Amino acid sequence: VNIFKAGADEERAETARLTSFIGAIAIGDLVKSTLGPKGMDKILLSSGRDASLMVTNDGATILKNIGVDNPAAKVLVDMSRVQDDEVGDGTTSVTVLAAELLREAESLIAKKIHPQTIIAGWREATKAAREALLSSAVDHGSDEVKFRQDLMNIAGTTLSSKLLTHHKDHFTKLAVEAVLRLKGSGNLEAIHIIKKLGGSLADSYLDEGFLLDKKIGVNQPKRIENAKILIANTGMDTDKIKIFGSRVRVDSTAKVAEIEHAEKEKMKEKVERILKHGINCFINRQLIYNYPEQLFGAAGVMAIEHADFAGVERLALVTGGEIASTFDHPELVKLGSCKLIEEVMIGEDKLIHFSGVALGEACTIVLRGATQQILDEAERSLHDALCVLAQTVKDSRTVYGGGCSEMLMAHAVTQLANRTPGKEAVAMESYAKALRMLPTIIADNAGYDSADLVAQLRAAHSEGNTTAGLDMREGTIGDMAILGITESFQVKRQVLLSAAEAAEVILRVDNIIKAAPR
């Protein structure tokens, strides 16, 4: 008998599983093309936004922009979003691995083993795999030489999936220098990513200093040397008032006239307080009235107005100044110092150049290239690279990738499968096969013979060649340490853990229930 309102469903334990798994596998095979050093990338187009479209390789964005109705698929999409929040790439990996997990779990359901046992076995295998992975980690502490070497290795690895691959060395230098500039600060906002058309992608670069996309005031000096810098949030054009909103009631317009006058002198003496610090460069996020800048030009002090909180932060980091207010005690505020300030034009627009900076805390990369899509995806790729690379700085351990690490995981899981004996062992072997499926897909998109490659790699690992991995420029097994095809431990750890949790939650479902959409 009808129970729900019209437009509501009830799928129980056959159709629920079927729909969930179809959605999961569809999501997986939807993104498999983007993974791998020879991987591909997608085109996503808005429904109607003047056709707002994003050529994309990072799977996280792909799942973000796609509208999915099957609830399990949406769960996976949120999963990828979180994983990107953590490491940047492997969203690709996480989704594809989860998808194959679900497909192979469906195959097990065909074998008709109770899902609860599947969950228990998968939990055991995941524990074993994470332990084996931890056993395979490699640290690099004070060894600055090997450290920086492995760092650029990480850059080259993760970068070689987006379009920037054919310039791996260049952007590798870029990211390495950028993150090394952070002095261990994990605040990526210290890195600004300016993008503007024109020039080859190779022309993209990191300045020696800092850049600002703002307009100078009226003719204050355009270029400044041995610049002294001061930063504040005190609004000027919003003429400083007393927020409660007192009136002004006066008997004669003489009084209103003198009140205007007093307003101007009050502004002027604030300006003079500013100048008492003896500072030739001043900025503020607020808009500045032109009378203040006229006073500034009378002092000949260059001033840049309306650089938002992000810009203020970056200036503070790069120049060491303490963004300020009321300027009341000059000795108690530390100014900002830079070697030189000048205006340079790139492509079409004059930009504010900050060379010779006291603090290397902040930086900003110029993005030259071909397409707003190309530039957009390059932006996204560099952001992911910076994310993973900062994570590397926080945790100075690495893992040998190229599928090699994952195959070690599978090998250990298979070994534990023998000590299992029971139905769980079937799920153990299941997990191992699903894990091994990843580099299979890699070499697949690499157009090499996947079947032999994976078997040979497993043979090498079961032998014990824990270093042997995959070459993507010739399609063969090789020493990863020679090739430096490595990645952060934390990345793959999150991959595994999140995938296991996703598998647990998805399999535990055995009924979908939709209320009628409003």
Binding site: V1, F4, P71, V75, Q116, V509, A515, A516, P517
Partner: protein, 98 residues
């Protein structure tokens, strides 16, 4: 949804949101029922939960099995009121033995 070996449900919100859970109170809360006694069971689970906690994992289960067997009795033409009275007596006995 009952038992450690039990399996939980996943709900779809009106606004397209999703939620996976095992707590029966939530299960019935998110449900869009129309038949009235379904609403009564939903409110049942809500009351039981925000009085105690889990157990809603099975309270409505008790309800349903009991009502099933009650129908078994009605088929033999027993008037419902005596059934109610007997069930009350049985409940008192059960709790005191418990």
């Amino acid at each position: 949804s009952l038992g450690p070996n039990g399996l939980d449900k996943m709900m779809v919100d009106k606004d397209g949101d999703v939620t996976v859970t095992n707590d029966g109170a939530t299960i019935l809360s998110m449900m869009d029922v129309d038949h009235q006694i379904a609403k009564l069971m939903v409110e049942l689970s809500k009351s039981q939960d925000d009085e105690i906690g889990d157990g809603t994992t099975g309270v409505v289960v008790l309800a349903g099995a009991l009502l099933e067997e009650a129908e078994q009795l009605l088929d033999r033409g027993i008037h419902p009121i005596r059934i109610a009275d007997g069930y009350e007596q049985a409940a008192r006995v059960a709790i005191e033995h418990l």
